[PDB]
Amino acid sequence: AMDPMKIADLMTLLDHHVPFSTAESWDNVGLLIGDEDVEVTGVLTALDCTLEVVNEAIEKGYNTIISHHPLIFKGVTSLKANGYGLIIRKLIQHDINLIAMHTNLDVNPYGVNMMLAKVMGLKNISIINNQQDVYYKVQTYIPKDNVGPFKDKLSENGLAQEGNYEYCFFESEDVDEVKIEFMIDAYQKSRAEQLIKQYHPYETPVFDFIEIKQTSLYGLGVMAEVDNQMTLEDFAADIKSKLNIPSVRFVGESNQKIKRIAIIGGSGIGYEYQAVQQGADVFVTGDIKHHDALDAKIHGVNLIDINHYSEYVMKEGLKTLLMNWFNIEKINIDVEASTINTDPFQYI
Amino acid sequence: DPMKIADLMTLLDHHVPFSTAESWDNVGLLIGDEDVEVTGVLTALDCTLEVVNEAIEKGYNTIISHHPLIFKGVTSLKANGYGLIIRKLIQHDINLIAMHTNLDVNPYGVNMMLAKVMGLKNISIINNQQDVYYKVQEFMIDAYQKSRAEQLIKQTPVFDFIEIKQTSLYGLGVMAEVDNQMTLEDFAADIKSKLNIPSVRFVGESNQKIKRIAIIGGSGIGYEYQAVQQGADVFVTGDIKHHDALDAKIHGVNLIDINHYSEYVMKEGLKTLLMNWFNIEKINIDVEASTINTDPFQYI
Amino acid sequence: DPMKIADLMTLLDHHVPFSTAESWDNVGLLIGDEDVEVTGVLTALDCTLEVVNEAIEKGYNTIISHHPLIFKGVTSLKANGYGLIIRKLIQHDINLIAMHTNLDVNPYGVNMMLAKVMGLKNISIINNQQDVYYKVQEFMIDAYQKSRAEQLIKQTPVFDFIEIKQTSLYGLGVMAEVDNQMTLEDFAADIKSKLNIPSVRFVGESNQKIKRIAIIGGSGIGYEYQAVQQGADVFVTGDIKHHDALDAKIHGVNLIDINHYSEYVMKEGLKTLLMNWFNIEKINIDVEASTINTDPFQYI
Amino acid sequence: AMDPMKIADLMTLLDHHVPFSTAESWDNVGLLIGDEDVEVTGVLTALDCTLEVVNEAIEKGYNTIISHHPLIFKGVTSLKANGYGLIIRKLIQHDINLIAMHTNLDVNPYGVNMMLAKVMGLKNISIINNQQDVYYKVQTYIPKDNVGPFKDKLSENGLAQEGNYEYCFFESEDVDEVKIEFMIDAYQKSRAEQLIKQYHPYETPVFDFIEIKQTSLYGLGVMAEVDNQMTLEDFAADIKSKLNIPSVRFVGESNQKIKRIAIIGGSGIGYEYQAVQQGADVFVTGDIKHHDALDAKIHGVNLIDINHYSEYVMKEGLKTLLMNWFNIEKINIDVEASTINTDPFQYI
Amino acid sequence: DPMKIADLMTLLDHHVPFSTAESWDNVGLLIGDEDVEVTGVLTALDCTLEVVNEAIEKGYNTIISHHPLIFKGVTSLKANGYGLIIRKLIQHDINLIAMHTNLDVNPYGVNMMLAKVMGLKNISIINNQQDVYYKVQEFMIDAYQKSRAEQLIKQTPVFDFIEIKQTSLYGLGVMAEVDNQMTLEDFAADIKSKLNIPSVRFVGESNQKIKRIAIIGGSGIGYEYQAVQQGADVFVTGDIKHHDALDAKIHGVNLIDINHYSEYVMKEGLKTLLMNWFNIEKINIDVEASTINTDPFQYI
Amino acid sequence: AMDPMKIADLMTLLDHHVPFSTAESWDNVGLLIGDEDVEVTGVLTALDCTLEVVNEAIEKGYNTIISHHPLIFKGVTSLKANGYGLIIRKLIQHDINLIAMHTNLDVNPYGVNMMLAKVMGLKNISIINNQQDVYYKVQTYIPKDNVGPFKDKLSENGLAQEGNYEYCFFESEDVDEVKIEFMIDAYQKSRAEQLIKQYHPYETPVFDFIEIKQTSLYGLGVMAEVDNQMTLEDFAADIKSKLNIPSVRFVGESNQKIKRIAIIGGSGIGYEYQAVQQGADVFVTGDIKHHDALDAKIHGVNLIDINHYSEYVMKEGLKTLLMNWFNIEKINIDVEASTINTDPFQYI
Ligand SMILES: [Zn+2]
Ligand SMILES: [Zn+2]
Ligand SMILES: [Zn+2]
Ligand SMILES: [Zn+2]
Ligand SMILES: [Zn+2]
Ligand SMILES: [Zn+2]
Ligand SMILES: [Zn+2]
Ligand SMILES: [Zn+2]
Ligand SMILES: [Zn+2]
Ligand SMILES: [Zn+2]
Ligand SMILES: [Zn+2]
Ligand SMILES: [Zn+2]
């Protein structure tokens, strides 16, 4: 008897590759509308889950929509047949599940900004603005001989990855001891306390947790470079064509030479000065407003507004990711990128 | 011409104006479609999953609850917790309307209803709101009338809108009285019995004499000192906590905790009001009070 | 008797009262010396270094900008960034005056100017401020008059100041209309051409029909729902972002982003007003609109 | 010539066993009304120091009242012959001292929640919601031979507990050194700096303080278990009887099987979800309100409201503690638990 | 029928209404028993332990201080610091009343008292409060009268309460004048001598000419710009700090720091007022000004 | 062709000796008005940069003013010919540069409070209220033999001061390793990550950054002592004379014996209780107000108000410092302390 993938199985897989915990604390991510117990019949990727997207999923026989933008962001106070209420109600009425992979996908090594840089044909793409993850270096003190492996083996048996580090030294030079050390993630602190107490000895078994911060693989934005050095206006025209953008605008001398590019898709104004500090010749983002562009201009910070809507690259990008992850796990569920242009703006 | 949700909403607003609700509150049509024809109305304190099941059972597509099922914004709608109730409503095409603080402050609302169930006399609204009305220079106008009256009166004329403040009919709480003075203990026992309450608790000497009573159903602590100022011998409310009771006791302010759940009286009270309003308008729609006891507490 | 900065400031305040500006805003003489004789006036949207160079070139010692060059307090004044422009003004004895939100809400200001440049009809101020005026008991008085009228009327008399609130002439935005209904797409194209805009974008079906138009130049998102309430078929503003456009789209609210930079129309609009005001007062001072395109954006 | 116990001596003893520093930072604990210099004539324990409690102390010839709840919580703005003013004035006029042992007693291993669990007849009682205490691992580098004990001995002489830990290694492999390490509490950092500077050598004597956090023995609440698995309603009836409560109310299916119990006496709503995470079958507390019970019910979190007033168990509990502490120290001062029922509520 | 604390409180409220005190302030009976018969009244700026000892010595059981001994809530009452003074009061059955900001804004209060001690002329309250009074439709009513007048006038009648705002008699500060113009230096020296101040300091050229003087006793910085607006040549207050003095100096605003402690003049000033009020009411109770110099500063 | 000192060269030198980063985060320090590219013609020191000070610099041919107090503190919203606008405009019009050395000079070992204590003739002067600086102890694990110096040499080549510390031990007792450790300042964390990755080996090169906090040399205030124990009033009269103060006021018994003195020039009320904890017999500051003096008196905290204006000692103090720093660097630029008494107060 089969184990067809349920929403709960999909959630675990999504979380493995694009951890929901990497989303900002203000964000609203994960299963927003649906039922964990339901069997997935197909997956439609979307930037914004508009009414037409829901209609498209229904028409295709798919019961799961993964969007970038959370359809429910601040709590909804009503669910009427109007506005966003009409979309939410239609999902529920048709038993469609909606998952949001929002800022977790913005900060992922394979997420929105890797996807943007790739579509722009750029090279040497690296995450920037790295998160910091908290670890602990756990240090225990134990006598030599057989009580060392006795510790090692039991500790490694009950989890806590089998990489240890051992040094001789004297407690008091009365009691000669071995100081053992290993790493734990911040969540394991509790378990590590338990397991050390259970399989150690004395009246006062000595153990320490030393906070270690490590640079994360996750961060908001990428730095990349063009193949060949280019003028600002030529780089702007190039990416307008590659991303099929109706209108692009840039801030800076049109003949400015550009090699290193920082990209935060969406609305990344607030990071442009830091991007310049980090080595960018231009900061690429959307939703750039007059006074921030004016400020950038006077300071010599070069900008390109590719429009917030250029995050739409994640529909095909995430479709490709998910098909790969499904291949690995030998899952045959169909994934399609929504073909609807959901940009609220029409350009003239 | 069959009554739709939109028509119900108009009628309810007429009799219990949604604008009298507190600004923090979430009232009106919370879940539904205003174009849908009302098949029947079930009244509820809390819209639990059992209450939704009851509406479905009775063939009713409209629930009016006191407490808003969605109060702070919902962050997700999953098949769990409150998500389950909201999803069940939507999937069964049930409309949910909340008449919350607008009902608490209505002259015929929660506190009138409590005082009637207690058999009280001389019941009047306390803690009255203030209505803003302009005298135009002379005749009277309401809040919104101030825009159009310029838009009308400017067809070179010299005119004036004078703000006048009027004590509202609407307010949180009622003051009322027993026929004859009774002890605090006897009054607490009397209302326990009348409201079918499993357990009541009071603050004050059992032999204190009670004539004038202030009532705020739900959770009305914060108002007990004012009530005493307004003439109450006792303040009746729910959800009274230790430190607030201890303060009242030391200050000589008498209280009775009838439990927040005592707002359940609005189910029958609202059923009766709505049957009457329907009668006036010649609407032939069935209204029932939910029979489900939705108190999360069981008393021993 | 030659006009000084102080005299200019008086005249500008007469026609576009600096007190109609928002309380957060920074308006008036921002950089200068009120005793200095005005040699000429250059109007500007943003006072860039190029605009300062232009004033110097033209022999003008007075610039009137819409946008305040100093908005939040300056923490330093170095030869870099905005420091460069402020220092250049001072070192060349150029006076900078900001007519910012007071011009946005003026009956002849930014939004009248936008609606005229679009060739619109029936243009009226929307979002009107409220003026406080007292009726004394009877005759009328203004804001400041309430002090002196006691100081005058107390020379034992029994008197009254009655607060009356009056719809102001001043407000953020105008409502206006085209001669004949046109599609949303055609109207957007029409205004693109009339304002010489490199790129315009709109929200709403291209074949939506437009008759009544609400305009707030600059960055007016926050007001689009109210505008629709006030009768607009479309809200015209700049600096529209994705999520605000997506919200409007789902709610059926039509928008056009003409870009914040479209406030540049106030350069010629202000030049014309100031030439007229000068004429009335028989002041022979040259006024020019800056010809510099100061948009930080270049469009492709 | 005697050393009769003064309030200041009592305060030191109280603080030793139920440290005032473990109280919450918003709390108001310790000597609230009185004179440190005054000789203690007897001690009356109380939940709330009401007028009748003060009258009881006067009648008994006791000049010290220890209450759980602070009679002065937010600053008093007046002291009139009315309300709480009348109680405060009566204490002062009769030279009665009032000490509050509030949230420090809530979080103590022998405090309010241990006492509740014991009165309920429960077993395997353990503190939960543990505080974290900050320590430092101080590391200094010193040459071997005689300068090691020279360091050890002087450091241990000037306090800083004589548990050291020593390891060989090379500074620069030019200057061979011994790295010595030991623990200090967070307050000793200053002294440790001084003492290391004074008895070390070089131009730049190398020493480090490494922050270590340890799970405290103090925490808000206990987890315990019933002897024999029981239904929720039976457990509720049992504890109503054991604590002599006029009325108890519970949230949950009456036949729910209960083994593990979390208890926060007083008003502990806000912790029930965490208690369930920590393994509780039911969260026992007081002052439970409708909407929080409604939420608990829908989420399957089981609750029992034993009333805030059930904290009254600390009068006899603290009396027993204090008599034990006085025995140890050979102090003959009488301690009595106030017999007044001070519950503002009367149940019908 | 001997005067109790409650009767004193009524009389003081009549002449120096406790409701004119700032909302942050702590005034009235701070420590005491309103049923206790007043044996005598000692006036005080600060109620120090020495002032309590003086009351006890004189056989007086009532102290009226300007500064509230309890301002923010007391968190403990131990035999140390301020605890010592509060405990001594209570243990000796001394009643402490605070007439703080209500005395600062009174027409006969701190600032009248300062201006009199300086020998000034044409003294008037500045910074006046606003009194709310309703004209009922016509006759006048006060703040509280608005409730009962409905409760009275509703025995179907159509009526109106019109809010009228009236300049109060009460305000922080006085404006006053010398008989003849004098230099800033000479005026500072004159008031130093008249108030027996060990050290005075002034801001402004020593030869500036002074005629009109604004005074706020205590710590009145924040009001100096307004005072100049109101016509003052100099603002007189205490507790002036470097940066506030430097700002005033650069703006041409003249100041004199007479020290916060100069509010001590209210001891004799209040003694005189209270003897007079007692006379009117035929109360034979002794009132003395405390003779203790309570300044924490000693000057060298 | 010369390298005459420009403002940018002066800024670097100032920052070296009195780091701008030690200023409070609310403060406004450094070059407030001027041009980094301009050649310095002479330096005038000032407490407050008043109009007369600017006039004095012009008259002397000096184009640089260093003040203690920042002429621009909260952003200026206008620059009119009035008030502070007139001073700012006059600086700009005459090409005068103004640097503020504000709270950085308050907390410097040679700054305002050292200068105050020295002018008072005091001894044993020590900074108090020390800042804490964040460092990292970087720990890497590397095999013995030749890969150790290979690491050492390259790491030391690319900066990161050549003080290392080495200990033997076993990774897994499979792979025997050397644990190397060294210090970095908090800014080097990024570089250290790079350089370790570049010149280390494995699939997972193990390195840790351990946060170390050290007591700074910078702090607000000094503690010092009088030569000979003195009465409070005599100490007050002495310092009034030494600093030429028109009027001094003190709080405390006039015959109180004084040996240890805490000094925060300016407006240091808020620190007096801590100063007493730290061992002061009197707290010396300016701008003392009635209610704070009243509080101090009742608590037995002794105060002397020497007036905020007594910070004027830094004009000659900083002149002396700067002349010394210029000597070292062989710079011939004139430095003069402004002679203008800029006290807004005149005493009578
Ligand atoms: Zn994104
Ligand atoms: Zn986005
Ligand atoms: Zn209610
Ligand atoms: Zn309720
Ligand atoms: Zn504008
Ligand atoms: Zn603008
Ligand atoms: Zn407790
Ligand atoms: Zn409690
Ligand atoms: Zn005062
Ligand atoms: Zn005062
Ligand atoms: Zn300073
Ligand atoms: Zn200073």
Side-chain angles (χ1 to χ4, degrees), chain E residues 146-151 156-195:
Chain E
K146 202 204 188 184
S147 321
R148 194 156 46 256
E150 305 159 1
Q151 209 262 344
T156 183
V158 169
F159 63 96
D160 319 78
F161 287 100
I162 307 187
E163 193 210 69
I164 282 107
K165 280 298 208 114
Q166 192 158 52
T167 306
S168 188
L169 292 195
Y170 301 99
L172 187 65
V174 300
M175 192 75 67
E177 60 193 54
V178 286
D179 294 297
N180 295 287
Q181 189 186 85
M182 64 196 296
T183 70
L184 180 60
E185 189 174 49
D186 288 350
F187 179 64
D190 192 51
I191 66 176
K192 178 184 177 182
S193 173
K194 290 176 174 166
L195 291 167

Side-chain angles (χ1 to χ4, degrees), chain F residues 305-337:
Chain F
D305 189 347
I306 56 169
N307 307 315
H308 192 139
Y309 185 72
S310 292
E311 296 196 281
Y312 81 85
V313 299
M314 60 54 68
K315 299 184 295 188
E316 296 286 355
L318 180 62
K319 178 232 177 108
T320 298
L321 293 174
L322 189 50
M323 291 187 330
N324 183 59
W325 304 332
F326 277 176
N327 174 57
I328 304 155
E329 229 95 299
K330 313 297 177 285
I331 287 142
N332 289 330
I333 290 156
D334 301 322
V335 187
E336 280 189 63

